[PDB]
Write a structure and sequence with these properties.
homodimer; 96 residues; mainly alpha; Inhibitor Of Apoptosis Protein (2mihbC-IAP-1), Chain A; three-stranded antiparallel β-sheet; 42% helix; 8% strand; globular; binds the ligand CCO[C@@H]1C[C@@H]2CN(C(=O)[C@@H](NC(=O)[C@H](C)NC)C3CCC(F)(F)CC3)[C@H](C(=O)N[C@@H]3CCOc4ccccc43)CN2C1; binds zinc ion; ligase/ligase inhibitor; BIR3; Baculoviral IAP repeat-containing protein 4; Apoptotic suppressor. Inhibitor of caspase-3
Chain lengths: 96, 96
């Protein structure tokens, strides 16, 4: 079923905690909203629910947009951002 | 919000009905199961939930796969098929 991969990190306050002095430019606070947590090797992160990992962030990129871009099938994403958002970003990423 | 775009076509029996002597190659049972109904022009179909239109079907195609390939945001799709399935087809598609 659609059960989250890491239920430990389902709680927001737990995710934000993994960014313990996070040196990279992308806003840690926003990253944890989008359902990601740090790892400890580079700027690597993962969604608690879908398990999709992202790395090498440009300065002002949006975690939500990237989450949708590469991992549109996440339930946490869908509940939080919805159908239109996800499909809209997908049909944009497509045009490349 | 994740409400169905066409709740009239939420029922499978409602969907299957729209394929009144369906001439085209693709299987109508599979099409309606995948959440599609016919529009009555060509082989154009839409998904009752996400509203994603698809057309010009090839003889052997899987409606579920095309649903996922093009509209990975569908709430109906996620529930029926799962995170892993959707992300998987997206990952594959991406490299084409
Ligand atoms: C190849 C097809 O695979 C798809 C593409 C997408 C790229 N990506 C990425 O993280 C890409 N990052 C971004 O798009 C960032 C968020 N914006 C620029 C990077 C891919 C390598 C690069 F050199 F191009 C720098 C950008 C993710 C990625 O590579 N994640 C890695 C892969 C292995 O698993 C993990 C686990 C944890 C963290 C990261 C990853 C997911 N990828 C799937
Ligand atoms: C550029 C970004 O747009 C994306 C691409 C994707 C392709 N597609 C399609 O339906 C494509 N069909 C398929 O992939 C079929 C299922 N397999 C070959 C065909 C588009 C026409 C074609 F002659 F080129 C043959 C492929 C769908 C499509 O064209 N749907 C149309 C768009 C307008 O709205 C409706 C409404 C009802 C039915 C179809 C559509 C969805 N598209 C979005
Ligand atoms: Zn996710
Ligand atoms: Zn996409
Ligand atoms: Zn759909
Ligand atoms: Zn895709």
């Amino acid at each position: 079923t659609n059960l989250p991969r890491n239920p430990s990190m389902a709680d927001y306050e737990a995710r934000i905690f993994t960014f313990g002095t996070w040196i990279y430019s992308v806003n840690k606070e926003q990253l944890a909203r989008a359902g990601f947590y740090a790892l400890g090797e580079g700027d690597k992160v993962k969604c608690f629910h879908c398990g999709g990992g992202l790395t090498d962030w440009k300065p002002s990129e949006d975690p939500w947009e990237q989450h949708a871009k590469w991992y549109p099938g996440c339930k946490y994403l869908l509940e939080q951002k919805g159908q239109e958002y996800i499909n809209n970003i997908h049909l944009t990423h497509s045009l490349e």
